[PDB]
Amino acid sequence: MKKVMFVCKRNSCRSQMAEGFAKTLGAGKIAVTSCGLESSRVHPTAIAMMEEVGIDISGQTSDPIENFNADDYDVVISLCGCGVNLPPEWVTQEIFEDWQLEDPDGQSLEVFRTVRGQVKERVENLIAKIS
Secondary structure, eight states: OEEEEESSSSSHHHHHHHHHHHHHHHHHEEEEEESSOOOOOOOOHHHHHHHTTOOOOOOOOOOOOOGSOOOOOOEEEEOOOOOOOOGGGGGSSSSEEEEOOOOOOOOOHHHHHHHHHHHHHHHHHHHHOOO
């Protein structure tokens, strides 16, 4: 097993969707947790996009980076945007990327759909490395 992490500027959107895909795609061979540089409520329209794929996020909650430790996570996927990054040990795990993505907080359904697709594809790519 490999442990994946998703970390956003707010957790609520980019990471939350990535967690929903990652557990559906790989729950049983990877363990996922999303966080954020700072927390915010899991965003409601996110639910709808995951419902398009046939998944949900209503049933889970948001969480700050501060509540965990990088040492437990094999792979860390920041999704802060504009190449913003994490000073702590989260950047020094076995795999690191920053998924530049159009943070769906308060956006149009087209932005949501674009990011939801991009995220899902990138979770599948990340799993393919570790599988």
